User: Which sequence fits this backbone?
């Protein structure tokens, strides 16, 4: 007996096109999304060129419209030069992304004054997301308060961070956050198996106590998002390994396993992979769209999942219970038991749908 | 014709006793203070042992009472273990010091949650000072807001930091700050002369634009404080140079030079070295205490000033106009033209004076 879920949304993926297409492209990354029960993705801007101006966004939109198999929205990225320049295209983007710490990314900012300038100039009704680790969470929260608006914190990975956010929420501050599956299902204890290259990710894998703190504070977690960050094995195993894990194909199976163990409920999962993503990023519904999963099927994660060009996975060898059997996207069968059945280009930019524009007061 | 100033206060000095007495001790450091026209100092807790518990404070109090030539208050330092343990001795200290970045200091904290715990447990009516650089300023400001209290930011050194504080003040937030003379009178341009060892200090020397931004934003600066941080030349020139400059003997002459050039007024100076220190740290007046200075005398800073055991200075070769001629402390001549005339032990702990206790609501 299969369980029907709504179309799930991953608000944090790296699809590497343009410029890193050996790692992933729109076609392979969205195939990976569909296989993981995800029907809508928000693609991060740290591509090559990065999506930091109108011409780069225009290019990315056409690449996505031609390559994507599921629906999508594209982030703009904040740079040291583009504050106050994105107003005409801002509403066409998923939101604005700030990279506030060292990681795989034209996009580190030099000064908190630059963060302020972005918070002041980006339209107030549109989403802002920050990569903000440890004390940087507190710092960007301060900037959000000085500028009287909200912020969404990406991949929370530490007890320190989740408790800070918890304290902010208790004070009524408008902050939301997401947690990635590797920070719920991997820890320092796995670094021996993974090794130092494969194990590179930002935020880094946490201690057992970090992992336990995220589960204990599930009520504080608004969204799950994969931070699908594909790099090839050669890259992960080489002399200067980039940080990141692929995760679209493994996220839902990992979480369904946790549901079957009673670690969270099916509703808890759907709030975090469907409802809260919709409401935080003002993402539209998808007509005639759903995912059928099998919660009984036990399997072991192989050395690589079928679709991502990353062709490796840090979850290799983990036992899971839960499978994506079928995905229907806008009335077409998109995925069945390992076969993707919609072509590159089937996917659409949800920000161009009338119901996908973010409501605003007349300016 | 001499100008009579009130007894000046330096809220940020490192006197190195106990445990680093080859660099400075209470007797030599307070001689340096008097020679610089300073009659009251607040001594930082990063000694050996550090002042992080009642027994260390008790030891430091006796050392200071026996060695100090001018009046003083002693900071407590925050550690990863002492939150919620300092209540009985808190009121006897200058305030609580948090070390939030890498520097010469049992006292880095591991987590912003630890900062929160200190802000929650330290008595609300008593001062808290943070060493907080760059984004850490924003982060500690967030913690202060979550806990609904004030914070004083030590040695602001960057355009980024002063503008962040300016923005916080414009929002009515209770934050004050100080700036040290090296961040007003030295910059990157001096590193060639200083070299990489002598030039080590935290916050590091800023760009010309940082220096210009501090002067332009003088209205935002509540206090000047030396961050007198003596280390010997051998240490500064050796293979692992500690950060810090000695500065008690040079601070007032540098600032008086600026006054004579019309860069700020005598009042601007006295607000920042007397009135604002008093009001932020609840420091008592000193009866029959004053400083006589000569604003006409031109001289060149030598390779070392007479008193500090540091026996070097990064201001060597700078021309100044302005001299401390005489200091009277509580009715005794304490300093005249290079001669200190009060013995070690003349100085007193101002927190033990009835007028030096911080007022509080009945608990
Ligand atoms: N998280 C990572 O380790 N890498 C991400 C960048 C990011 O999300 O910060 C990537 O794009 O490779
Ligand atoms: N500022 C420095 O470079 N050094 C200070 C420590 C401090 O004030 O942070 C010291 O005590 O040596
Ligand atoms: Zn990130
Ligand atoms: Zn990412
Ligand atoms: Zn400091
Ligand atoms: Zn200091």
Assistant:
């Amino acid at each position: 007996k299969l369980v029907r879920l709504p179309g799930l949304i991953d608000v944090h993926v790296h699809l590497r096109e343009p410029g890193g297409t050996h790692k992933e492209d729109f076609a392979s990354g969205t195939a990976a999304a569909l296989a993981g029960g995800i029907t809508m993705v928000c693609a991060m801007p740290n591509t090559r060129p990065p999506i930091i101006d109108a011409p780069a966004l225009a290019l990315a939109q056409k690449l996505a419209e031609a390559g994507a198999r599921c629906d999508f929205a594209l982030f703009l990225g904040a740079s040291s030069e583009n504050a106050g320049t994105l107003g005409t295209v801002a509403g066409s983007a998923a939101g604005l992304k700030l990279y506030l710490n060292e990681t795989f990314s034209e996009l580190r900012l030099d000064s908190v004054v630059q963060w302020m300038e972005h918070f002041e100039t980006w339209p107030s009704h549109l989403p802002i997301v920050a990569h903000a680790e440890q004390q940087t969470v507190a710092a960007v929260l301060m900037v959000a308060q000085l500028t009287q608006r909200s912020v969404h914190i990406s991949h929370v990975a530490r007890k320190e961070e989740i408790l800070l956010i918890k304290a902010a929420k208790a004070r009524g501050l408008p902050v939301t956050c997401e947690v990635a599956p590797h920070h719920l299902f991997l820890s320092h204890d796995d670094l021996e198996r993974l090794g130092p290259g494969k194990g590179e990710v930002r935020p880094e894998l946490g201690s057992r106590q970090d992992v336990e703190a995220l589960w204990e504070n599930m009520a504080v977690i608004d969204c799950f998002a994969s931070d699908h960050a594909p790099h090839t094995l050669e890259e992960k195993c080489g002399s200067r390994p980039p940080p990141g894990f692929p995760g679209l194909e493994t996220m839902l199976p990992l979480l369904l396993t946790a549901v079957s163990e009673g670690r969270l409920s099916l509703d808890d999962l759907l709030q975090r992979l469907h409802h809260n993503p919709r409401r935080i990023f003002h993402l539209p519904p998808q007509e005639d769209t759903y995912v059928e999963v099998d919660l009984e099927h036990e399997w072991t994660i192989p050395s690589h999942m079928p679709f991502s060009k990353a062709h490796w996975t840090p979850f290799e060898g983990q036992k899971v219970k839960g499978t994506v059997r079928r995905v229907v996207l806008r009335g077409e069968v998109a995925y069945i038991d390992g076969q993707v059945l919609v072509p590159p280009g089937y996917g659409q930019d949800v920000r161009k749908w009338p119901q996908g524009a973010v409501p605003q007061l007349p300016p």
User: Anything to note?
Assistant: Chain A has one domain: 1-363. The two ends of chain A are 51 Å apart (CA to CA).
